Enzyme design. Sequence first.
Site, PDB file in Angstrom:
ATOM      1  N   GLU A 238       1.448  -1.342   0.178  1.00 35.96           N
ATOM      2  CA  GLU A 238       0.717   0.636  -0.187  1.00 35.96           C
ATOM      3  C   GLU A 238       1.152   1.743  -0.067  1.00 35.96           C
ATOM      4  OE1 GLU A 238      -0.600  -1.144   4.163  1.00 35.96           O
ATOM      5  OE2 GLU A 238      -1.636   0.341   4.561  1.00 35.96           O
ATOM      6  N   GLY A 256      -7.688  -5.559   7.945  1.00 33.11           N
ATOM      7  CA  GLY A 256      -8.825  -6.028   7.612  1.00 33.11           C
ATOM      8  C   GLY A 256      -7.841  -7.509   6.255  1.00 33.11           C
ATOM      9  N   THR A 257      -6.893  -8.888   7.382  1.00 29.60           N
ATOM     10  CA  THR A 257      -6.372  -9.179   6.096  1.00 29.60           C
ATOM     11  C   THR A 257      -6.541 -11.237   6.931  1.00 29.60           C
ATOM     12  OG1 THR A 257      -4.301  -8.631   6.661  1.00 29.60           O
ATOM     13  CG2 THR A 257      -4.042 -10.747   6.906  1.00 29.60           C
ATOM     14  N   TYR A 371      11.523  -0.577   8.476  1.00 27.86           N
ATOM     15  CA  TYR A 371      10.246  -1.469   8.626  1.00 27.86           C
ATOM     16  C   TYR A 371       9.039   0.076   9.351  1.00 27.86           C
ATOM     17  CZ  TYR A 371       6.682  -4.955  10.291  1.00 27.86           C
ATOM     18  OH  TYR A 371       5.020  -4.651  10.743  1.00 27.86           O
ATOM     19  N   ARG A 391       6.824  -6.460   4.431  1.00 27.24           N
ATOM     20  CA  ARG A 391       6.972  -7.696   2.953  1.00 27.24           C
ATOM     21  C   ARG A 391       8.166  -7.112   2.641  1.00 27.24           C
ATOM     22  NH1 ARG A 391       0.559  -7.529   3.177  1.00 27.24           N
ATOM     23  NH2 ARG A 391       0.544  -6.941   5.304  1.00 27.24           N
ATOM     24  N   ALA A 406       0.963  -6.785  12.663  1.00 26.39           N
ATOM     25  CA  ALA A 406      -0.494  -7.584  12.643  1.00 26.39           C
ATOM     26  C   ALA A 406      -1.237  -6.136  14.252  1.00 26.39           C
ATOM     27  CB  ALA A 406      -0.985  -8.965  13.858  1.00 26.39           C
ATOM     28  N   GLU A 417      -3.308 -13.528  16.268  1.00 24.35           N
ATOM     29  CA  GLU A 417      -2.420 -12.633  15.499  1.00 24.35           C
ATOM     30  C   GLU A 417      -0.620 -13.312  15.279  1.00 24.35           C
ATOM     31  OE1 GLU A 417      -3.489 -10.249  14.972  1.00 24.35           O
ATOM     32  OE2 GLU A 417      -5.209 -10.388  16.236  1.00 24.35           O
TER      33      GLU A 417
END
Length: 435
Positions: A238, A256-257, A371, A391, A406, A417
């Site tokens: 994103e 939301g994953t 990160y 990622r 998370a 989580e």
Amino acid sequence: SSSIPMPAGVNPADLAAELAAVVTESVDEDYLLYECDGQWVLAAGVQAMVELDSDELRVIRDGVTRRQQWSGRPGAALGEAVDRLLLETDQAFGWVAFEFGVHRYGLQQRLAPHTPLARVFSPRTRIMVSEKEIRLFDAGIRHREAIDRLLATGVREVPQSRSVDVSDDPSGFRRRVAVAVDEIAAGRYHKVILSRCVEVPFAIDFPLTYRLGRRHNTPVRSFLLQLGGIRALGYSPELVTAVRADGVVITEPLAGTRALGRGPAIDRLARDDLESNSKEIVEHAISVRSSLEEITDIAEPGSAAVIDFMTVRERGSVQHLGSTIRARLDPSSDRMAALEALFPAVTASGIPKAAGVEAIFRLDECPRGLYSGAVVMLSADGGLDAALTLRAAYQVGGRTWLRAGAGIIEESEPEREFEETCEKLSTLTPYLVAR
């Protein structure tokens, strides 16, 4: 500024990453490879470097280090230095730490001496690889020669990968999640994103790993770099901020994953779960409300809008609910203010922001550094493109590692989580090429 057609059998990501490797082999230079809307931009060599730390700003060019003190907003300091780079070159490239975002929330006091906030350079050369052509900007005879040799030998075969165990918890993520849940239940904040590092016990080949993972992912931006002793690569899911030359500003909260990549039917079950799941919908709506409040701080009045609301965004090993928020940059603002307003990304930090970011100092491994910061491409026409750094894999000194996190809310459980972190780590973990 010349151009070469693209050989026929060959994918732009593979050729750009191979170029990055060939040029390391030949000229031993730092670089940043940034994929942005079907252009793989290889920013090769450092012509000048801007280093923003918590306690100093340095500009380094041709041996010479200019040292400056700075006060006030980190974005104002960085912007002054980068705008000067961009007089001499069309584009500037680098990374912005998570720690760049903390000043706005009254946490500057917490950063140790010499805490990196940003590294932004003007390249000597750019090579732009796309499906149709390779464009060369300011390439020297020595560089063109090695591009010509790459085109003559073709791209290497990617070796078999080498696995890593992510199932261990040396940093006590499950303990740390429980601490945050207790804090949330006591009303300290609504949400915090915590994370864990996973060590990679062998050296990886960053360009070949970049290539292998790219075949198995669909990010919004991607990057591969070797800068100032840091190697990194990642598949950004994103944008935290993009600012167009015309003043349009974009941000892309994901919250939301579920897992993805487990088979078409199983993935469809997960998608349908995600899109209908009240807990995930509520937290997504709340995240959009918060991002909108943020973008409204730099927006022309009445210009902040949600242009894509709560749509499933497929990101390799995971799928997310995502929105896209737009505004027009107020004439009283600037691109660095826009970054600051949206930093750190709400969906990688917490809600409310000041309490959530502070929880991260206490309950995560700090500094976060790259990160949940951003990898950035700035343009002389006003452009800013800032991919959220998730990622991703990193190497600094003898240490190679992955990191994933998370979103923890009142009803979170440590086991689910931890598993969500595994799902996210699987964006990279099947694709690590040794060496």
